[PDB]
Amino acid sequence: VSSAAVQWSWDAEFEEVSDDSPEFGQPEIPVKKAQGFVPISIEALQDEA
């Protein structure tokens, strides 16, 4: 959750105050995948040390 600061102002006597509702935001961070593959042969597996 992210937000921003409220904004003030200089007012005189008997002056109506403004609407100063803060604003909100919601960042997202997705999760991804990576992979690898190394095929080998049976004879290669048995001979190579």
Binding site: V1, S21, P22, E23, F24, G25, Q26
Partner: protein, 47 residues
Amino acid sequence: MGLTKADGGYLVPFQLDPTVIITSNGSLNDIRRFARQVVATGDVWHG
């Protein structure tokens, strides 16, 4: 500032019920309580 998302609606907790509700009629039957059951070994049972 109300229940809308951009006006402070991102702070309400997400409420969820983990349990699973089954939406299938299924079946009820009673042969297996009255009938006779025999254990087979191969593919064909002879009597």
